[PDB]
Subunit: 147 residues, 4 copies
Protein backbone atom coordinates (compact mmCIF):
# COMPACT_ATOMS: atom_id res chain seq x y z
CA UNK A 1 0.00 0.00 0.00
CA UNK A 2 1.31 3.43 -0.99
CA UNK A 3 3.49 4.65 1.77
CA UNK A 4 6.41 2.30 1.15
CA UNK A 5 5.36 1.95 -2.51
CA UNK A 6 6.16 5.66 -2.91
CA UNK A 7 9.77 5.24 -1.72
CA UNK A 8 10.67 2.44 -4.17
CA UNK A 9 11.99 4.60 -7.07
CA UNK A 10 14.56 6.09 -4.70
CA UNK A 11 15.47 2.59 -3.51
CA UNK A 12 16.16 1.64 -7.12
CA UNK A 13 18.27 4.72 -7.79
CA UNK A 14 20.51 3.74 -4.88
CA UNK A 15 20.51 0.09 -5.94
CA UNK A 16 21.22 1.02 -9.56
CA UNK A 17 24.03 3.45 -8.71
CA UNK A 18 25.42 0.82 -6.33
CA UNK A 19 25.89 -1.68 -9.16
CA UNK A 20 27.40 1.17 -11.17
CA UNK A 21 30.07 1.43 -8.46
CA UNK A 22 31.07 -2.23 -8.75
CA UNK A 23 31.28 -1.86 -12.54
CA UNK A 24 33.55 1.18 -12.64
CA UNK A 25 35.74 0.06 -9.73
CA UNK A 26 36.11 -3.33 -11.46
CA UNK A 27 37.07 -1.75 -14.79
CA UNK A 28 39.40 0.46 -12.78
CA UNK A 29 40.67 -2.44 -10.65
CA UNK A 30 41.50 -4.41 -13.80
CA UNK A 31 43.67 -1.56 -15.11
CA UNK A 32 45.54 -0.74 -11.93
CA UNK A 33 46.29 -4.21 -10.60
CA UNK A 34 45.41 -7.07 -12.98
CA UNK A 35 48.92 -6.94 -14.44
CA UNK A 36 50.47 -7.91 -11.11
CA UNK A 37 47.42 -9.81 -9.76
CA UNK A 38 45.83 -11.81 -12.61
CA UNK A 39 44.11 -14.15 -10.16
CA UNK A 40 42.11 -11.36 -8.48
CA UNK A 41 41.88 -8.49 -10.98
CA UNK A 42 43.07 -10.12 -14.21
CA UNK A 43 39.63 -10.09 -15.85
CA UNK A 44 36.61 -7.84 -15.45
CA UNK A 45 34.74 -10.75 -13.88
CA UNK A 46 37.54 -11.53 -11.43
CA UNK A 47 37.62 -7.85 -10.44
CA UNK A 48 33.86 -7.75 -9.78
CA UNK A 49 34.20 -10.81 -7.57
CA UNK A 50 37.25 -9.77 -5.54
CA UNK A 51 35.51 -6.44 -4.89
CA UNK A 52 32.39 -8.33 -3.80
CA UNK A 53 34.52 -10.48 -1.50
CA UNK A 54 36.11 -7.36 0.02
CA UNK A 55 32.68 -5.94 0.87
CA UNK A 56 31.36 -9.18 2.41
CA UNK A 57 34.43 -9.46 4.69
CA UNK A 58 35.50 -12.78 3.15
CA UNK A 59 38.92 -11.13 2.73
CA UNK A 60 39.33 -10.51 6.46
CA UNK A 61 42.04 -13.09 7.25
CA UNK A 62 43.05 -14.05 3.69
CA UNK A 63 42.64 -10.31 3.00
CA UNK A 64 42.84 -9.56 -0.76
CA UNK A 65 43.38 -5.87 0.04
CA UNK A 66 46.55 -6.21 2.12
CA UNK A 67 48.82 -7.98 -0.45
CA UNK A 68 47.88 -5.40 -3.08
CA UNK A 69 48.39 -2.69 -0.46
CA UNK A 70 51.93 -3.95 0.20
CA UNK A 71 52.93 -4.10 -3.47
CA UNK A 72 51.46 -0.74 -4.45
CA UNK A 73 51.75 1.37 -1.26
CA UNK A 74 49.30 4.01 -2.54
CA UNK A 75 46.45 1.65 -3.47
CA UNK A 76 44.23 2.71 -0.56
CA UNK A 77 43.23 5.63 -2.84
CA UNK A 78 41.06 2.97 -4.54
CA UNK A 79 40.24 0.39 -1.85
CA UNK A 80 39.12 3.08 0.63
CA UNK A 81 36.71 5.11 -1.59
CA UNK A 82 35.19 1.91 -2.99
CA UNK A 83 34.46 0.54 0.49
CA UNK A 84 33.07 3.92 1.54
CA UNK A 85 30.72 4.66 -1.37
CA UNK A 86 29.48 1.06 -1.63
CA UNK A 87 28.80 0.88 2.11
CA UNK A 88 27.11 4.29 2.10
CA UNK A 89 24.80 3.15 -0.70
CA UNK A 90 23.73 -0.03 1.12
CA UNK A 91 23.12 2.17 4.17
CA UNK A 92 20.87 4.41 2.06
CA UNK A 93 18.83 1.32 1.17
CA UNK A 94 17.92 0.77 4.83
CA UNK A 95 17.66 4.50 5.61
CA UNK A 96 15.14 4.95 2.80
CA UNK A 97 12.88 2.28 4.32
CA UNK A 98 13.33 3.70 7.84
CA UNK A 99 12.34 7.16 6.58
CA UNK A 100 9.40 5.79 4.56
CA UNK A 101 7.94 4.10 7.65
CA UNK A 102 8.40 6.93 10.17
CA UNK A 103 7.36 9.49 7.54
CA UNK A 104 3.97 7.75 7.37
CA UNK A 105 3.44 7.73 11.15
CA UNK A 106 4.23 11.45 11.43
CA UNK A 107 1.69 12.14 8.67
CA UNK A 108 -1.04 10.14 10.43
CA UNK A 109 -0.46 11.78 13.82
CA UNK A 110 -0.65 15.05 11.86
CA UNK A 111 -4.37 14.54 11.15
CA UNK A 112 -5.48 12.98 14.45
CA UNK A 113 -4.12 16.11 16.15
CA UNK A 114 -5.73 18.49 13.64
CA UNK A 115 -9.11 16.74 13.84
CA UNK A 116 -8.98 16.84 17.64
CA UNK A 117 -8.48 20.61 17.44
CA UNK A 118 -11.32 21.04 14.94
CA UNK A 119 -13.49 18.85 17.17
CA UNK A 120 -12.75 20.78 20.37
CA UNK A 121 -13.52 24.03 18.54
CA UNK A 122 -16.79 22.75 17.07
CA UNK A 123 -17.85 21.55 20.52
CA UNK A 124 -16.67 24.64 22.42
CA UNK A 125 -18.70 26.82 20.04
CA UNK A 126 -21.73 24.52 20.30
CA UNK A 127 -21.56 24.76 24.10
CA UNK A 128 -21.41 28.55 23.88
CA UNK A 129 -24.21 28.76 21.33
CA UNK A 130 -26.67 26.65 23.34
CA UNK A 131 -25.83 28.76 26.40
CA UNK A 132 -26.70 31.78 24.23
CA UNK A 133 -30.17 30.65 23.12
CA UNK A 134 -31.12 29.74 26.69
CA UNK A 135 -30.15 33.26 27.76
CA UNK A 136 -32.00 34.89 24.85
CA UNK A 137 -35.14 33.05 25.97
CA UNK A 138 -34.86 34.20 29.60
CA UNK A 139 -34.34 37.77 28.36
CA UNK A 140 -37.57 37.66 26.37
CA UNK A 141 -39.30 36.31 29.48
CA UNK A 142 -37.82 39.26 31.38
CA UNK A 143 -39.26 41.72 28.84
CA UNK A 144 -42.72 40.14 29.21
CA UNK A 145 -42.89 40.89 32.92
CA UNK A 146 -42.29 44.44 31.72
CA UNK A 147 -45.15 44.87 29.25
Amino acid sequence: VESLMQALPGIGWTAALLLMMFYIFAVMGTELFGEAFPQWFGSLGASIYSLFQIMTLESWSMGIARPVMEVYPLAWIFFVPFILISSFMVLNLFIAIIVSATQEVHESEQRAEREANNLIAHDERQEMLDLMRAMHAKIVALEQQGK
Copy 2:
Protein backbone atom coordinates in the same frame (compact mmCIF):
# COMPACT_ATOMS: atom_id res chain seq x y z
CA GLU B 1 1.11 20.15 -13.81
CA SER B 2 0.95 17.21 -11.41
CA LEU B 3 2.30 14.54 -13.75
CA MET B 4 4.77 17.01 -15.27
CA GLN B 5 6.21 17.28 -11.75
CA ALA B 6 7.15 13.56 -11.70
CA LEU B 7 8.91 13.37 -15.09
CA PRO B 8 12.52 14.01 -13.91
CA GLY B 9 12.23 10.97 -11.64
CA ILE B 10 10.82 8.96 -14.55
CA GLY B 11 13.91 9.87 -16.57
CA TRP B 12 16.31 8.95 -13.77
CA THR B 13 14.78 5.46 -13.69
CA ALA B 14 14.72 5.25 -17.49
CA ALA B 15 18.31 6.51 -17.72
CA LEU B 16 19.65 4.16 -15.04
CA LEU B 17 17.71 1.34 -16.72
CA LEU B 18 19.64 1.78 -19.97
CA MET B 19 22.79 1.96 -17.85
CA MET B 20 21.96 -1.56 -16.64
CA PHE B 21 21.77 -3.00 -20.15
CA TYR B 22 25.10 -1.34 -20.99
CA ILE B 23 27.10 -2.67 -18.05
CA PHE B 24 25.52 -6.13 -18.10
CA ALA B 25 26.27 -6.29 -21.84
CA VAL B 26 29.90 -5.27 -21.36
CA MET B 27 29.98 -7.81 -18.55
CA GLY B 28 28.12 -10.44 -20.57
CA THR B 29 30.63 -10.06 -23.40
CA GLU B 30 33.54 -10.77 -21.03
CA LEU B 31 32.05 -13.71 -19.17
CA PHE B 32 30.46 -15.65 -22.00
CA GLY B 33 31.21 -14.34 -25.51
CA GLU B 34 34.26 -16.60 -25.68
CA ALA B 35 32.05 -19.71 -25.51
CA PHE B 36 28.91 -18.10 -27.00
CA PRO B 37 29.96 -15.78 -29.86
CA GLN B 38 26.46 -15.87 -31.36
CA TRP B 39 24.78 -14.41 -28.27
CA PHE B 40 27.46 -12.49 -26.35
CA GLY B 41 30.30 -12.32 -28.87
CA SER B 42 29.94 -8.59 -29.50
CA LEU B 43 28.66 -5.73 -27.37
CA GLY B 44 25.68 -5.40 -29.70
CA ALA B 45 24.87 -9.12 -29.55
CA SER B 46 25.04 -8.96 -25.75
CA ILE B 47 22.64 -5.98 -25.57
CA TYR B 48 20.18 -7.89 -27.77
CA SER B 49 20.31 -11.28 -26.03
CA LEU B 50 19.75 -9.44 -22.74
CA PHE B 51 16.79 -7.62 -24.31
CA GLN B 52 15.42 -10.95 -25.53
CA ILE B 53 15.76 -12.43 -22.03
CA MET B 54 13.69 -9.60 -20.55
CA THR B 55 10.93 -9.80 -23.18
CA LEU B 56 10.53 -13.57 -22.61
CA GLU B 57 11.48 -14.41 -26.21
CA SER B 58 13.97 -16.79 -24.54
CA TRP B 59 11.30 -18.86 -22.79
CA SER B 60 11.31 -22.03 -24.92
CA MET B 61 14.42 -21.26 -26.96
CA GLY B 62 15.81 -19.86 -23.72
CA ILE B 63 19.24 -18.29 -24.08
CA ALA B 64 19.79 -18.43 -20.31
CA ARG B 65 19.53 -22.21 -19.92
CA PRO B 66 22.39 -23.31 -22.25
CA VAL B 67 24.75 -20.76 -20.68
CA MET B 68 23.53 -21.90 -17.25
CA GLU B 69 24.35 -25.49 -18.27
CA VAL B 70 27.93 -24.69 -19.35
CA TYR B 71 28.87 -22.32 -16.55
CA PRO B 72 26.92 -23.65 -13.53
CA LEU B 73 27.41 -20.43 -11.54
CA ALA B 74 26.14 -17.98 -14.18
CA TRP B 75 22.89 -17.22 -12.34
CA ILE B 76 25.01 -14.74 -10.34
CA PHE B 77 24.65 -12.58 -13.49
CA PHE B 78 21.35 -13.62 -15.11
CA VAL B 79 19.43 -13.29 -11.82
CA PRO B 80 20.57 -9.79 -10.70
CA PHE B 81 20.14 -8.44 -14.24
CA ILE B 82 16.55 -9.70 -14.46
CA LEU B 83 15.85 -8.34 -10.98
CA ILE B 84 17.25 -4.81 -11.30
CA SER B 85 15.93 -4.31 -14.84
CA SER B 86 12.45 -5.50 -13.86
CA PHE B 87 12.48 -3.38 -10.69
CA MET B 88 13.34 -0.30 -12.76
CA VAL B 89 10.49 -0.84 -15.23
CA LEU B 90 8.23 -1.32 -12.20
CA ASN B 91 9.41 2.04 -10.84
CA LEU B 92 8.32 3.63 -14.14
CA PHE B 93 4.71 2.59 -13.53
CA ILE B 94 4.88 3.17 -9.76
CA ALA B 95 6.04 6.75 -10.33
CA ILE B 96 2.97 7.47 -12.46
CA ILE B 97 0.66 5.72 -9.98
CA VAL B 98 2.08 7.83 -7.15
CA SER B 99 1.92 11.04 -9.21
CA ALA B 100 -1.80 10.53 -9.88
CA THR B 101 -2.93 9.51 -6.39
CA GLN B 102 -0.63 12.12 -4.84
CA GLU B 103 -2.64 14.79 -6.67
CA VAL B 104 -6.03 13.48 -5.51
CA HIS B 105 -4.92 13.39 -1.87
CA GLU B 106 -3.74 17.01 -2.19
CA SER B 107 -7.08 18.15 -3.64
CA GLU B 108 -9.17 16.38 -0.99
CA GLN B 109 -6.81 18.09 1.48
CA ARG B 110 -8.23 21.54 0.62
CA ALA B 111 -11.91 20.65 0.14
CA GLU B 112 -11.83 19.29 3.70
CA ARG B 113 -9.96 22.31 5.10
CA GLU B 114 -12.28 24.79 3.36
CA ALA B 115 -15.32 22.93 4.67
CA ASN B 116 -13.95 23.32 8.20
CA ASN B 117 -13.20 27.02 7.70
CA LEU B 118 -16.70 27.43 6.24
CA ILE B 119 -18.47 25.67 9.12
CA ALA B 120 -16.51 27.81 11.58
CA HIS B 121 -17.27 31.08 9.74
CA ASP B 122 -20.96 30.15 9.69
CA GLU B 123 -21.16 28.84 13.27
CA ARG B 124 -19.66 32.12 14.50
CA GLN B 125 -21.99 34.17 12.28
CA GLU B 126 -24.98 32.30 13.72
CA MET B 127 -23.74 33.00 17.25
CA LEU B 128 -23.01 36.65 16.52
CA ASP B 129 -26.43 37.43 15.05
CA LEU B 130 -28.03 35.73 18.05
CA MET B 131 -25.89 38.04 20.19
CA ARG B 132 -27.00 41.33 18.63
CA ALA B 133 -30.66 40.31 18.88
CA MET B 134 -30.10 39.63 22.59
CA HIS B 135 -28.27 42.92 23.13
CA ALA B 136 -31.23 44.76 21.61
CA LYS B 137 -33.82 43.07 23.83
CA ILE B 138 -31.65 43.87 26.86
CA VAL B 139 -31.61 47.56 26.01
CA ALA B 140 -35.40 47.33 25.65
CA LEU B 141 -35.43 45.69 29.08
CA GLU B 142 -33.48 48.63 30.57
CA GLN B 143 -35.92 51.14 29.06
CA GLN B 144 -38.95 50.02 30.99
CA GLY B 145 -36.66 50.42 33.99
CA LYS B 146 -35.98 54.13 33.45
Copy 3:
Protein backbone atom coordinates in the same frame (compact mmCIF):
# COMPACT_ATOMS: atom_id res chain seq x y z
CA GLU C 1 16.44 28.82 -0.86
CA SER C 2 13.70 27.90 -3.30
CA LEU C 3 15.64 27.29 -6.50
CA MET C 4 18.53 26.14 -4.29
CA GLN C 5 16.20 23.33 -3.18
CA ALA C 6 16.02 21.99 -6.73
CA LEU C 7 19.67 21.96 -7.88
CA PRO C 8 20.57 18.37 -6.82
CA GLY C 9 17.76 17.09 -9.04
CA ILE C 10 19.01 19.31 -11.87
CA GLY C 11 22.42 17.67 -11.54
CA TRP C 12 21.00 14.14 -11.51
CA THR C 13 19.30 14.86 -14.84
CA ALA C 14 22.41 16.59 -16.20
CA ALA C 15 24.65 13.76 -14.98
CA LEU C 16 22.44 10.99 -16.37
CA LEU C 17 22.21 12.98 -19.62
CA LEU C 18 25.97 12.82 -20.14
CA MET C 19 25.76 9.14 -19.24
CA MET C 20 23.45 8.72 -22.23
CA PHE C 21 25.93 10.24 -24.67
CA TYR C 22 28.67 7.98 -23.27
CA ILE C 23 26.82 4.67 -23.60
CA PHE C 24 25.22 5.51 -26.95
CA ALA C 25 28.68 6.53 -28.22
CA VAL C 26 30.23 3.27 -27.01
CA MET C 27 27.28 1.50 -28.67
CA GLY C 28 27.47 3.67 -31.76
CA THR C 29 31.13 2.76 -32.18
CA GLU C 30 30.36 -0.97 -32.06
CA LEU C 31 27.33 -1.00 -34.33
CA PHE C 32 28.44 1.36 -37.08
CA GLY C 33 32.09 2.48 -36.86
CA GLU C 34 33.15 -0.46 -39.01
CA ALA C 35 31.13 0.86 -41.97
CA PHE C 36 31.27 4.56 -40.97
CA PRO C 37 34.76 5.33 -39.60
CA GLN C 38 34.32 9.06 -40.25
CA TRP C 39 31.29 9.37 -37.94
CA PHE C 40 31.45 6.47 -35.46
CA GLY C 41 34.98 5.15 -36.00
CA SER C 42 36.28 6.38 -32.64
CA LEU C 43 34.61 7.01 -29.30
CA GLY C 44 35.21 10.73 -29.78
CA ALA C 45 33.76 10.75 -33.29
CA SER C 46 30.69 8.92 -31.96
CA ILE C 47 30.13 11.47 -29.17
CA TYR C 48 30.32 14.26 -31.71
CA SER C 49 28.05 12.80 -34.39
CA LEU C 50 25.49 12.11 -31.65
CA PHE C 51 25.85 15.71 -30.47
CA GLN C 52 25.36 16.91 -34.05
CA ILE C 53 22.22 14.79 -34.39
CA MET C 54 20.70 16.40 -31.29
CA THR C 55 21.53 19.97 -32.35
CA LEU C 56 19.89 19.44 -35.78
CA GLU C 57 23.15 20.06 -37.65
CA SER C 58 22.40 16.80 -39.45
CA TRP C 59 19.10 18.14 -40.83
CA SER C 60 20.06 18.37 -44.52
CA MET C 61 23.44 16.57 -44.44
CA GLY C 62 21.64 14.14 -42.13
CA ILE C 63 24.12 11.69 -40.52
CA ALA C 64 21.19 9.48 -39.48
CA ARG C 65 19.74 8.81 -42.95
CA PRO C 66 22.83 7.26 -44.65
CA VAL C 67 23.29 4.90 -41.69
CA MET C 68 19.54 4.23 -41.78
CA GLU C 69 19.80 3.24 -45.45
CA VAL C 70 22.73 0.86 -44.95
CA TYR C 71 21.41 -0.83 -41.82
CA PRO C 72 17.60 -0.71 -42.22
CA LEU C 73 16.98 -1.50 -38.53
CA ALA C 74 19.22 1.21 -37.04
CA TRP C 75 16.30 3.35 -35.84
CA ILE C 76 16.28 1.00 -32.80
CA PHE C 77 19.29 3.11 -31.73
CA PHE C 78 18.80 6.56 -33.29
CA VAL C 79 15.20 6.80 -32.02
CA PRO C 80 15.70 5.89 -28.31
CA PHE C 81 18.81 8.09 -28.12
CA ILE C 82 16.95 11.13 -29.47
CA LEU C 83 14.03 10.39 -27.13
CA ILE C 84 15.87 9.90 -23.83
CA SER C 85 18.34 12.74 -24.47
CA SER C 86 15.53 15.14 -25.39
CA PHE C 87 13.43 14.04 -22.41
CA MET C 88 16.37 14.74 -20.08
CA VAL C 89 16.92 18.26 -21.42
CA LEU C 90 13.18 18.80 -21.01
CA ASN C 91 13.46 17.71 -17.37
CA LEU C 92 16.10 20.41 -16.89
CA PHE C 93 13.59 23.14 -17.78
CA ILE C 94 10.66 21.38 -16.08
CA ALA C 95 12.61 21.22 -12.82
CA ILE C 96 13.10 25.00 -12.85
CA ILE C 97 9.46 25.60 -13.83
CA VAL C 98 8.31 23.43 -10.92
CA SER C 99 10.78 25.04 -8.49
CA ALA C 100 9.42 28.51 -9.27
CA THR C 101 5.69 27.76 -9.21
CA GLN C 102 6.16 25.47 -6.20
CA GLU C 103 7.41 28.51 -4.26
CA VAL C 104 4.47 30.74 -5.25
CA HIS C 105 1.93 28.10 -4.19
CA GLU C 106 3.68 27.82 -0.82
CA SER C 107 3.58 31.59 -0.25
CA GLU C 108 -0.10 31.93 -1.18
CA GLN C 109 -0.60 29.03 1.25
CA ARG C 110 0.31 31.24 4.24
CA ALA C 111 -1.28 34.53 3.15
CA GLU C 112 -4.58 32.63 2.93
CA ARG C 113 -4.08 30.86 6.28
CA GLU C 114 -3.10 34.09 8.07
CA ALA C 115 -6.14 35.85 6.61
CA ASN C 116 -8.34 33.11 8.09
CA ASN C 117 -6.62 33.31 11.49
CA LEU C 118 -6.97 37.10 11.34
CA ILE C 119 -10.69 37.06 10.49
CA ALA C 120 -11.27 34.59 13.33
CA HIS C 121 -9.30 36.63 15.87
CA ASP C 122 -11.23 39.74 14.86
CA GLU C 123 -14.66 38.07 14.71
CA ARG C 124 -14.13 36.74 18.24
CA GLN C 125 -12.87 40.13 19.46
CA GLU C 126 -15.99 41.79 18.04
CA MET C 127 -18.18 39.23 19.81
CA LEU C 128 -16.29 39.51 23.08
CA ASP C 129 -16.50 43.31 23.30
CA LEU C 130 -20.22 43.05 22.49
CA MET C 131 -20.39 40.64 25.45
CA ARG C 132 -18.78 42.85 28.09
CA ALA C 133 -21.01 45.77 27.09
CA MET C 134 -24.04 43.54 27.63
CA HIS C 135 -22.75 42.18 30.94
CA ALA C 136 -22.46 45.78 32.14
CA LYS C 137 -25.99 46.74 31.11
CA ILE C 138 -27.33 43.64 32.85
CA VAL C 139 -25.62 44.59 36.12
CA ALA C 140 -27.22 48.02 35.70
CA LEU C 141 -30.55 46.20 35.23
CA GLU C 142 -30.07 44.34 38.50
CA GLN C 143 -29.35 47.58 40.38
CA GLN C 144 -32.71 49.04 39.45
CA GLY C 145 -34.00 45.90 41.16
CA LYS C 146 -32.28 46.15 44.55
Copy 4:
Protein backbone atom coordinates in the same frame (compact mmCIF):
# COMPACT_ATOMS: atom_id res chain seq x y z
CA GLU D 1 16.50 12.16 11.78
CA SER D 2 16.37 15.41 9.78
CA LEU D 3 19.84 15.13 8.25
CA MET D 4 19.13 11.38 8.06
CA GLN D 5 16.32 12.14 5.60
CA ALA D 6 18.77 13.73 3.19
CA LEU D 7 21.56 11.13 2.97
CA PRO D 8 20.20 9.07 0.01
CA GLY D 9 20.24 12.23 -2.10
CA ILE D 10 23.78 12.96 -0.91
CA GLY D 11 24.82 9.53 -2.16
CA TRP D 12 23.12 9.96 -5.53
CA THR D 13 25.17 13.11 -6.08
CA ALA D 14 28.33 11.46 -4.74
CA ALA D 15 27.73 8.35 -6.86
CA LEU D 16 26.99 10.28 -10.06
CA LEU D 17 30.05 12.43 -9.32
CA LEU D 18 32.36 9.40 -9.42
CA MET D 19 30.54 8.37 -12.59
CA MET D 20 31.71 11.65 -14.13
CA PHE D 21 35.37 10.98 -13.40
CA TYR D 22 35.02 7.48 -14.88
CA ILE D 23 33.46 8.49 -18.21
CA PHE D 24 35.61 11.60 -18.65
CA ALA D 25 38.68 9.45 -17.95
CA VAL D 26 37.64 6.80 -20.48
CA MET D 27 36.95 9.68 -22.83
CA GLY D 28 40.16 11.51 -21.92
CA THR D 29 42.16 8.36 -22.68
CA GLU D 30 40.67 8.15 -26.19
CA LEU D 31 40.98 11.79 -27.16
CA PHE D 32 44.43 12.63 -25.82
CA GLY D 33 46.41 9.64 -24.50
CA GLU D 34 47.99 9.07 -27.91
CA ALA D 35 49.67 12.49 -27.80
CA PHE D 36 49.90 12.70 -23.98
CA PRO D 37 50.76 9.23 -22.61
CA GLN D 38 52.04 10.70 -19.35
CA TRP D 39 48.72 12.33 -18.43
CA PHE D 40 46.00 10.41 -20.29
CA GLY D 41 47.89 7.34 -21.53
CA SER D 42 46.13 4.94 -19.16
CA LEU D 43 42.72 4.96 -17.52
CA GLY D 44 44.40 5.48 -14.16
CA ALA D 45 46.54 8.37 -15.42
CA SER D 46 43.41 9.99 -16.86
CA ILE D 47 41.50 9.70 -13.57
CA TYR D 48 44.42 11.35 -11.77
CA SER D 49 45.08 14.22 -14.19
CA LEU D 50 41.35 15.00 -14.05
CA PHE D 51 41.52 14.93 -10.24
CA GLN D 52 44.52 17.27 -10.36
CA ILE D 53 42.63 19.66 -12.64
CA MET D 54 39.75 19.88 -10.16
CA THR D 55 42.00 20.45 -7.12
CA LEU D 56 43.82 23.32 -8.88
CA GLU D 57 47.19 21.53 -8.72
CA SER D 58 47.28 22.28 -12.48
CA TRP D 59 47.18 26.05 -12.02
CA SER D 60 50.78 27.05 -12.82
CA MET D 61 51.80 23.60 -14.02
CA GLY D 62 48.45 23.48 -15.75
CA ILE D 63 47.78 20.19 -17.54
CA ALA D 64 44.84 21.74 -19.41
CA ARG D 65 46.74 24.45 -21.27
CA PRO D 66 49.30 22.26 -23.15
CA VAL D 67 46.50 19.96 -24.34
CA MET D 68 44.39 23.03 -25.19
CA GLU D 69 47.27 24.20 -27.13
CA VAL D 70 47.84 21.09 -29.28
CA TYR D 71 44.14 20.39 -29.87
CA PRO D 72 42.55 23.87 -30.11
CA LEU D 73 39.01 22.51 -29.63
CA ALA D 74 39.65 20.49 -26.45
CA TRP D 75 37.75 22.91 -24.19
CA ILE D 76 34.61 21.02 -25.38
CA PHE D 77 35.84 18.39 -22.87
CA PHE D 78 37.79 20.28 -20.19
CA VAL D 79 34.99 22.84 -19.72
CA PRO D 80 31.97 20.49 -19.29
CA PHE D 81 33.97 18.22 -16.98
CA ILE D 82 34.95 21.11 -14.70
CA LEU D 83 31.35 22.37 -14.75
CA ILE D 84 29.46 19.15 -13.99
CA SER D 85 31.99 17.95 -11.40
CA SER D 86 31.96 21.31 -9.62
CA PHE D 87 28.15 21.49 -9.75
CA MET D 88 27.93 18.04 -8.14
CA VAL D 89 30.25 18.96 -5.26
CA LEU D 90 28.14 22.10 -4.83
CA ASN D 91 25.02 19.93 -4.59
CA LEU D 92 26.70 18.03 -1.74
CA PHE D 93 26.87 21.20 0.37
CA ILE D 94 23.52 22.54 -0.86
CA ALA D 95 21.80 19.31 0.20
CA ILE D 96 23.08 19.74 3.76
CA ILE D 97 22.19 23.45 3.80
CA VAL D 98 18.64 22.61 2.69
CA SER D 99 18.34 19.72 5.16
CA ALA D 100 19.22 22.01 8.08
CA THR D 101 17.06 25.02 7.18
CA GLN D 102 14.23 22.71 6.09
CA GLU D 103 14.09 21.41 9.67
CA VAL D 104 13.99 24.87 11.26
CA HIS D 105 11.13 25.99 9.01
CA GLU D 106 9.19 22.86 9.99
CA SER D 107 9.68 23.51 13.72
CA GLU D 108 8.66 27.17 13.51
CA GLN D 109 5.64 25.84 11.60
CA ARG D 110 4.25 24.15 14.73
CA ALA D 111 5.20 26.74 17.36
CA GLU D 112 3.19 29.25 15.32
CA ARG D 113 0.24 26.89 14.83
CA GLU D 114 0.13 25.93 18.52
CA ALA D 115 0.24 29.60 19.51
CA ASN D 116 -2.82 30.20 17.32
CA ASN D 117 -4.66 27.19 18.75
CA LEU D 118 -3.72 28.39 22.25
CA ILE D 119 -4.93 31.97 21.71
CA ALA D 120 -8.20 30.60 20.33
CA HIS D 121 -8.71 28.15 23.22
CA ASP D 122 -8.07 30.99 25.68
CA GLU D 123 -10.11 33.65 23.87
CA ARG D 124 -13.10 31.24 23.84
CA GLN D 125 -12.57 30.35 27.50
CA GLU D 126 -12.54 34.05 28.42
CA MET D 127 -15.79 34.54 26.50
CA LEU D 128 -17.43 31.47 28.00
CA ASP D 129 -16.70 32.38 31.62
CA LEU D 130 -18.04 35.87 30.93
CA MET D 131 -21.16 34.13 29.61
CA ARG D 132 -21.89 32.01 32.69
CA ALA D 133 -21.40 34.97 35.02
CA MET D 134 -23.93 36.73 32.84
CA HIS D 135 -26.39 33.90 32.76
CA ALA D 136 -26.31 33.96 36.58
CA LYS D 137 -27.01 37.68 36.98
CA ILE D 138 -29.95 37.26 34.58
CA VAL D 139 -31.50 34.52 36.69
CA ALA D 140 -31.05 36.83 39.68
CA LEU D 141 -32.75 39.51 37.55
CA GLU D 142 -35.76 37.21 37.01
CA GLN D 143 -36.07 36.43 40.73
CA GLN D 144 -36.59 40.12 41.44
CA GLY D 145 -39.56 39.70 39.16
CA LYS D 146 -41.37 36.70 40.64
